[model samples]
Target chain A: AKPQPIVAANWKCNGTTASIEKLVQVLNEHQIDHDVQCVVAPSFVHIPMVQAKLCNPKYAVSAENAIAKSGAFTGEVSMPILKDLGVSWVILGHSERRTYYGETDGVVAQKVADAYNQGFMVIACIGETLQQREANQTAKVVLSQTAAIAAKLPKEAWSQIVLAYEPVWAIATPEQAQEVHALLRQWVSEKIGNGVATKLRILYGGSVTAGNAKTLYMKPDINGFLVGGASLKPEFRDIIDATR
Target chain B: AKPQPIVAANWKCNGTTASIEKLVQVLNEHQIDHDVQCVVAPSFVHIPMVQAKLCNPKYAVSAENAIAKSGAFTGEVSMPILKDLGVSWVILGHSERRTYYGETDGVVAQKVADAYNQGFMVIACIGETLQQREANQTAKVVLSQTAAIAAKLPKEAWSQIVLAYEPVWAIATPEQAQEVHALLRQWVSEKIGNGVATKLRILYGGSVTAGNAKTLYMKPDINGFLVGGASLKPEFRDIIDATR
Candidate 1:
């Protein structure tokens, strides 16, 4: 069976326009390895710029987040606009959306269903918080997020889903990451049937960088990575190369 | 003494990357009148894109809105980020913010303090609803909005304040706007004192268009306009020219 590798870089409100322009020109224009898929999630404004600037069969863009299907929601990026811009992928359930924005399990489930029906593939994010792990509710927390989306999604939608289990405990701290990545690997196999699970690409996010990328990639369950701060750097190429 | 023209535009979350490139190409590369101060308030995601594309001296860019200050607020741009982006102007008290986000006058006052302490010029918007107008509370509504900001503001900050009086009933309807512009003009003159009032540009915002601009600019009290839909188009130039 062929290994499916996905590396998504999320530049969350980090760069100025000129800097993002350069980011698009480099990461999008450069001939990335054909075997691996590379995605860049610029803040919503830069999605069109990145997609327009860089074109490759191996490259695609994702909105940092998308609004629900309706048009009248104020101060939101619309899903229809995503399709018009040729955006194929979207990142939902980022930690910031859950903790700060008050998005719940049911809301994330609906977000997944909405973006899925809109013909966009989803990088559905699942993670356990620091307290959850301390209480040993790690799997329980991640499962709730996973089950919430999985309940609404058709079994066929698994073809379009990429599960990213980023542990909130290790999020920004110098805590162990790959150790938890090993836990996610075992968790996916048990939660989803082995046949469907075998096809799924699970990535580890929450501060995965160039320096730590190789060790994470070496783990059996780790298909690739979703990088954060280091993705804003040109050295993100170092992490991108980890997939190869 | 010269009257400062309070010119601002709302991007209304209407752009993608390709659209951003074109917006920058048209607004930045083209020639605009030197005397007519220009500001483009793009969607939050697109501000940096618009900012980088502007020409020196003729153009400035600002966010649709920003948080009172940075930290702990998700999805809200902060005042420091606005200042860092070189944003010299801000529009608070907009109906969209009040209607959709539940932003109260008290919250808006906090934002005014945030913007003023950072030294940005502000357009403090005020207006009465259709029901409020029928109840003859137009002056009361306008004064409360003005007074809210004025009470929290530094006394000298009036120089940095430009008042936009937009009647909620007048927008998106076929009603003639010039009559209402006349009332707002008289009301502001009586409030801010004649000397400060004369220097302040009292702008009519509801349903501004190229067709109405020439007539709106003709009113002795209608010193300028705060355009809506027309501002996103190239016709913003014509609206600016109407002031000449």
Candidate 2:
């Protein structure tokens, strides 16, 4: 069986204390389905605020990123600090981090493995660029990215990992997203094992909105979403409802 | 006149919440001299906890880094959010960011400009690698680094900026540090103006421990120290006392 649907909000470099307080209040007031797992990944600074203010037990707090280990990496939040702040999840290898900050496949894999080993769940992201997609290298690109991570951990580690396919290009439609999600699941089945692949939750990202979420979720391999922009608004509730 | 002597701690990816609470308690209990400015730059997650717990009005909390502008940059903490968290200072362009993370001169300059324009004080860092220093390209390298930032902002912005010369190699004796500091101040005087250069606080970093801090601070051009590993320990108070 597929794992429970996860609707995670990557607030990305957004949110002030005032706005985050309001957003947490809005999220807590709503009644979310128990079968669905809801998470909000605020920028590293806001993780503490969100963790403290999010009164709803069903909704957990996440850090947008964490260093694989602690010490001497200035401007980085370490896994120990994130765990201390009660952050249950970490979003690793976002397209923005790879494109702008130069987080390579190996670096992302190390971060995922370290975070997982430290008992934190990871939304490990992999995706193809517009150039790669146009060059007919989408499979080659994403598969290599996933393989980098798969090489780093044991099959059992896959259980704690949610693979998010967030293409560098935000032009993914529901069908386009389903196609990639299916490909990733197939790769997992072929490389890891059918049991692991069947249990893994592959998520669709890149311009995910409430309007397209239900249709996207209906796909066999598209287990859930790692929403970006829409996650900041009230419409995220509707997207979470799509899990039903 | 020279600005007040500052002793800023770059906690850099270290500390758990429990440890930070204890560290803040230690910091609060100490009686730092009023004439010497003190700042602590914790990893992003600990800023909120530090701000809430730091009882000393004289000591300000700082972010180790911040994106020049907010939005869509995942895994980055932005200036707006840092301000809302009551962070009055930002440590930009650390050698770790420049060396390991690939923050080029142009990027560091933009970050310094943006952080300064937003009214946040900046501890902008610059330094040459050991190879550069070995080849005696130290002046050319550090000057070009400072020139990049100087080109980005007007002379007035210098008041809000504390230039940190953290040589990529941590082998700087007080004499070597003073040599580079004097050269940098000369460049500032010639390029920006004598008045601006006279008032600028150039800090020496890289393996800054309490044993060497007093001697390092005695140099005419070295206005303060940016303590790294030692900042997490009780010796930081003695380093702060070196200003007396």
Candidate 3:
């Protein structure tokens, strides 16, 4: 049996208090089925507002990122702080963090282990850049990213993890997404076990829209989306319902 | 002849929700005189709680850091988001950011410019490591950091900035701090203008305690403190009252 589908909105460094309030209002009205899990990852500053106003049990709030440990690292938020803020999920190791903020595979793995140990669900992202894809190193790159985390975390801890495959280059066709998702599942099955692979949820991220969401959802291996730009719009509802 | 003393708390990557609430309650009871300015910088997760609970107008809330701009930078907070959250101040270019997160001088300048432009006051931090001090390159290193921000922002924008001199090695003697603070003022006088130098508040940071606050405050060039670990304790109030 397939795992429950998760449509997580990655509100990456966007939304004002007023706009977030409005977005939360729209999301509050969503009558999502139990078979589908909906999560919204807001910027660190907006999480409190979104959490307070987004009063629906079916919907959960996520922090876009967090530091592995607490104390002395100025300007960085820690996993303990996120756990204290009532954030249910954290999206760690996003490609942007790896590319722009210098988050190494080792750093990402540490973050994943730390957040999991603190009892927060994690959406750990992994993918290849366009240059790597052109060089046909996609599998090598993503598998290494996953292997880093798997090395640090125990096999039983996979139950709390959702893997988000966000290609550095936006807009992968459904076939391409399915291929990568299938490859990831196979990697897990061979390395960790068939049980962990079957239960793990792999999300397709990168410019997912209502237009492409239905087709993306149709793929056997593509569990759901980590929607970016479209996640802020009312059309996010359509993407969520597409799982039906 | 001097700017009003600013005793800012840098609760770097620390605090739980309950602890923050308790701290704010302790602060609310302070009979702070009008001559002193107190600012509290909590982690991004706790800013909303601190802002809502810290009702005294004399006490302004600050974010430890923010990105130069908004959009697409996952796991990073932006100045506009901070502005909307009623965050009046931002601490930019902290040595920890430079050392741990790879925030280059140019990146720090952009962040300072963006935060100042967004109508937020900035505490721009600069300092030398023990190696630089050992080599007698302390003045050379600190001035260059200031020059980067000076090149990016205009002279008038200096009013919105409080330059913090936090020795990376921590625990600078009063004379040592005064020497560096005077050197910075001279740099400002030469590079920007005497008028700007005279008005710019230069803060002494790093392991400041109630015991040292008075001696540090007595220095003509030392305008205030950018407090660290001591900020979480009741001695923070003593540091603030040291201005008296």
Candidate 2, after superposition: displacement of residue A107 in Å? 1.9
Error of 1 at A210 (Å): 3.6
* Candidate 1 residue pairs in clash (backbone atoms < 3 Å): A48-B17, A49-B17
Per-residue lDDT, model 2, residue A53, is 80
The candidates, ranked best first by TM-score, are 3, 2, 1
lDDT of 2 by residue, B103-177 (tens): 899999999999989999999999998889889899999999999998989878888999989878654678989
- lDDT score, candidate 1, position B148: 82
Q: If both were scored by TM-score, which would come out higher, candidate 2 or candidate 3?
A: 3
Docking class of 1: incorrect
Those runs of model 1 whose alpha carbons end farther than 4 Å from true positions after fitting are A1-3, A17-34, A44-59, A68-75, A82-86, A131-136, A169-195, B15-35, B44-60, B67-90, B101-107, B117-119, B124-152, B166-195, B210-221, B232-244
Residue-level lDDT of model 1, residues A135-166, one tens digit each, is 98976777677889888987778778887877
Q: What is the lDDT for A207 in model 2? A: 81
lDDT (Cα, tens digit) per residue for candidate 3, span A1-244: 6789999999999888888888788878988765798999999888888888887676799999998778999999988888777786999999999989989999999989998889889999999988899999989999999999999899899999999998886536788889999999999999999999999999998778889898898998988989999999888989999987
Cα RMSD for predicted model 2: 1.6
Could you tell which candidate, 2 or 3, scores higher by DockQ? 3
Candidate 1 per-residue lDDT over residues B1-244, each given as its tens digit:
3475656676665767686676567665556554776677766556655666666466677566656664323334566656655677888878767665556888788888878888888877778788888898876787777778777875577788777777785543323344554555565467646676667677777777778777666666666667677776777777777777
Each candidate's interface RMSD: 4.1, 0.9, 0.7
